[PDB]
Nucleic acid binder design. Structure first.
Ligand SMILES: [Zn+2]
Ligand SMILES: [Zn+2]
Length: 205
DNA sequence: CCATCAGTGTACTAGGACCCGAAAATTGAGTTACAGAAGTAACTGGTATACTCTGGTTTCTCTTCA
């Protein structure tokens, strides 16, 4: 919605990089899940025609654009004259952009999404008229879902690297086939591996 | 009747070559130096496969002693 703050769209973009759980759970897979990456790395920024609207709303937020502006303040790199902003003092109605031109939305460190303002139109009477739901999803992609590599009946909850049982190197397992292949009777890892929790992108996105 | 179990009708991948254009880089001529290395362009021996009388040979009647 025009005249609707930025960070009203940043908080709406469903990306699975917000739901990834950190750390490795090989020794014991019953650990209290570390906070999803939505909570740990709260920083993000839009880039709209030479101005990094940074999400400095929270204290855990740090300037992701500082890296780029420093990297460009060095040796000339094509780019030049980068700006900054705060993304809570801005609405889409205050923004000076091109249509159909790719801009940036970086979040979770370097999960980059290419933003394209396809068109701008005055609101009609036959579309949604609310605001409580308006940065709303017109279309999404319906990605594929990874499955457990042992039995192809359930989706992958775990991804293991350097597994001394897996044929493939990154091997995805459901919970059942993971518990059954790597753990003797009480949680002592059998063999060697690095198991991480796997958020299926084709499910939470 | 609620279990199960191929097919199906598709956008969504997965390899798998392959192409289209752009931008950067080179090539090319022009000069004038510089030293040295390629790069043909030229006359001038040197030793073998035919080769041409020729020196010897060979019966074959004869020459010359004996
Ligand atoms: Zn993302
Ligand atoms: Zn499984």
């Amino acid at each position: 919605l025009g005249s609707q703050k930025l960070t009203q769209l940043r908080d709406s973009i469903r990306c699975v990089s917000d739901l990834q759980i950190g750390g490795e759970f090989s020794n014991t897979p019953d650990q209290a899940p570390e906070h999803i990456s939505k909570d740990l790395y709260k920083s993000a920024f839009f880039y709209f025609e030479g101005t990094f609207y940074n999400d400095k709303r929270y204290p855990e937020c740090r300037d992701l654009s500082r890296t780029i502006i420093e990297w460009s303040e060095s040796h000339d790199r094509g780019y030049g004259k980068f700006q900054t902003a705060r993304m809570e003092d801005f609405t889409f109605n205050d923004l000076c952009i091109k249509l159909g031109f790719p801009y940036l939305y970086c979040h979770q460190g370097d999960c980059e999404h290419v933003i394209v303002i396809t068109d701008i139109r005055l609101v009609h009477h036959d579309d949604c008229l609310d605001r409580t739901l308006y940065p709303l999803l017109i279309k999404k992609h319906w990605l594929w879902t990874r499955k457990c590599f042992v039995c192809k009946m359930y989706t992958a909850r775990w991804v293991t690297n350097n597994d001394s049982f897996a044929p493939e190197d990154p091997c995805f397992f459901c919970d059942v086939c993971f518990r059954m292949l790597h753990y003797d009777s009480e949680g002592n890892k059998l063999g060697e591996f690095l198991a991480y929790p796997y958020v299926d992108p084709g499910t939470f996105n």
